[model samples]
Target: GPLGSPLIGEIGPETYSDYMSAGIPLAYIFAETAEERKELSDKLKPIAEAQRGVINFGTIDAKAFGAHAGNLNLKTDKFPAFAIQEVAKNQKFPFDQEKEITFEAIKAFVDDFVAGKIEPSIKSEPIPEKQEG
Candidate 1:
């Protein structure tokens, strides 16, 4: 993700492939229609808009994408979670559920990520196999 443009958009199961297959770095927010989700999404809009070309932003409904969220280490209990995936490096970082999800907070989160202050918490993994043996 670069700093020149802000890039954010909505995400869903239907459009998930585009993101998973995106060539550039990307971020996604997992949430439902709760008031908090809308508020948080607003905070993300400016960053995505400001850095659109270099960084990609999108949102997904929590209920529909439980597995997607899980892969990012996002728990459904935390309804409004965010994950930024650096496809090239195969690393992804999700917003800490304990932190506040405010406009300033989100902006700072992005700033920190861009500055290398936050380290990736997870790398995408293959689905676990069933224990037939």
Candidate 2:
């Protein structure tokens, strides 16, 4: 068995391929600083353990890979952001930036996401209804 945080890992260009090839849903915590990354990883460790084998947890360097955040429907300005990416379905569920990225908050978000209760965030707006003739 692996000795280190097997359930959680660092996600970067060097390890991006491995995580992608993992063929499982990925839960990512994006932060601009290493300190924030470590903090978020610590907070998410329990959730990662709880959802072991079901979802993969990792931290991404927001400063280095902030561009990738846009693809996940996350704002680049926000640090310590959280999101779940379903690679199989190519779906992304980004946590609300307005809310704090706490364990309880992310836990509920992940639960809803895994249960298929949360809708994927889209950049487009809904079509307006037509007027009655």
Candidate 3:
């Protein structure tokens, strides 16, 4: 039986795409100390209304990163700082209690698990060998 197009892949990120497709215009900031970020989001809210949906908190800093660049692999750099340790302590995926989840690692884990074999390693260009006829 196939895993059938992972449910996580179908989460419908249209609004998220809209936010990141340009850049995450949103920022996370404390209300007391974040007058600047708040002001920006305030002004941008109306402008974003012209599009499809709301701007998200992660997309701004995230867009600059390679898709694999974040700390947890799927969530924010703050993931470690903000993890609900009580819950995450329950079960860590792929047997690592401490490893953070990343898109690349998770997908590879799943593909190999479902397919029953890991993909063969790619061949690299051979190193130069001394010719001794």
Candidate 4:
């Protein structure tokens, strides 16, 4: 899985960010054969907005996403990359549950982001208009 939930302070790629910002972001659990993307989206709808400050579960194929531009998915529009999955959340960084995540890790990570470690976007300044002398 390329994307993991930031829920417990995990740093995942930006592709999944759209899904992570939700109070509790949900990723497609590839392990679970029965689940689908829409279900994840629909189930999340009730709690997704409250969970996410701005949007939905930020659907993405994390592992497949290419950092550089000009990916096949961009041109043919068929390749699937950059997704958030359960495997990632359960792996790397989730230490309390003996291999899974605990609230502590999650909260701590968020604290770091708020502390200014995470960079914010800068809006461009406006240009001045010329006088109509």
Instruction: Find the candidate with the highest TM-score and give its number.
Output: 2
Q: Candidate 2 on 1-133: residue-level lDDT in tens?
A: 7677444687766556655678888888777778656567776877677777888788776777766766778877776677788878867887766678777778777988888898767754456669433
Q: How many clashes does the backbone of model 2 have?
A: 0
TM-score of each: 0.73, 0.80, 0.20, 0.24
TM-score of candidate 3 relative to the true fold? 0.20
How many clashing pairs does model 3 include?
Answer: 2
- The window of 10 residues in a row where model 4 has the poorest summed lDDT is 88-97
Quote the positional error of residue 18 for candidate 3 in Å. 31
Tens-place lDDT per residue, model 4, 1-133, is 6596444222357544544344332422111112354543343344333435422233333234322111211221221222222222321111111222222433343233333353222212356678432
Listed per candidate, the RMSD to the true structure in angstroms reads: 6.4, 4.9, 18.4, 14.0
Give the whole-model CA lDDT for all candidates, comma-separated.
0.68, 0.74, 0.28, 0.30
Write one digit per residue (lDDT tens) for candidate 3, span 87-117.
1122111212246333344334433432445
Clashing pairs in 3: 24-59, 24-60
CA displacement after TM-score superposition, residue 81 of candidate 4 (Å): 14
Stretches > 4 Å off in candidate 2 = 1-7, 123-133
Q: Which ten residues in a row have the lowest lDDT in candidate 2?
A: 124-133
lDDT of 1 by residue, 1-133 (tens): 7776323567656556666576766777777555566677888877576557656788776667746765856666765677777766766766766777666776678768867897755553456668432
lDDT of 4 at 9: 24
lDDT order of candidates, top first? 2, 1, 4, 3
Relative to the unseen true structure, what is the C-alpha lDDT of residue 101 in candidate 2, on a scale of 0 to 100? 78
